[PDB]
């Protein structure tokens, strides 16, 4: 099964980071350097 | 005797059957269907003429006219619902 990691971030910005990560993935998913991430959690 | 006399009606059962078979509304036509249609036409005509004669006697006349027909049609609620979209000359 896949592993789960933690990464700090500025206090108060989680949805912004999530949407930014989603945008980066959707942008670089049809290139030679795709993102191997499965998902991210921001409770 | 003629089918009209057989049925006891006054409208022409034979002409009705011929018109039906000529218009080709169906491959065939039963024996009771034409008699029934002639009877319906006769009843409707009898009702219209009754109301027209009533209107004429009210207007004090000896001959039915389009005015009496119109008066009858617009006084009978059912005939109005039946001939709303109908037009008449003069």
């Amino acid at each position: 099964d896949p592993n789960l990691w933690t990464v700090k971030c500025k206090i108060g910005e989680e949805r912004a980071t999530a949407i930014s990560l989603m945008r980066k993935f959707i942008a670089y998913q049809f290139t030679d350097t795709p993102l191997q991430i499965k998902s991210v959690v921001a409770p | 005797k003629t089918r009209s006399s057989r049925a006891g009606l006054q409208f022409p059962v034979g002409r009705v059957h011929r018109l039906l078979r000529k218009g080709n509304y169906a491959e065939r036509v039963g024996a009771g269907a034409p008699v029934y249609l002639a009877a319906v036409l006769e009843y409707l005509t009898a009702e219209i003429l009754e109301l027209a004669g009533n209107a004429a006697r009210d207007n004090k006349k000896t001959r039915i006219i389009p005015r009496h027909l119109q008066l009858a049609v617009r006084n009978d609620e059912e005939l109005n619902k039946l001939l709303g979209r109908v037009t008449i000359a003069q």
């Binding site: 896949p2 999530a18 993935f25 959707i26 991430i37 499965k38 991210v40 959690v41 | -």
Partner: protein, 116 residues
Amino acid sequence: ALETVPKDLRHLRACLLCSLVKTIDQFEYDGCDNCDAYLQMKGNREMVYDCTSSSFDGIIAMMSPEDSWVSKWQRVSNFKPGVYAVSVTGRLPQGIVRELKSRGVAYKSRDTAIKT
């Protein structure tokens, strides 16, 4: 795709069947993507406000349901990639939930959260 990613954080709802979190404008224009033929959520805000509900929590960047423990747990492996949630409080009317089972759509409660 660029049509399922939420555009603006403000004014956002979520579904109860597949738990599809998007923007109100997206729900109004395109509507539910994972369940459209068996919902007719597309083409009006009325069915949107009737079925979906803004009472939901959690955001997960679902990108590989075929291979993901979160999808296997949440039961969203047969859905398209997107941004889903982990809790949605609500319930569909009787008339809206009976047709699902009549046509062949199993209605399950996505509210995995606990109460008290």
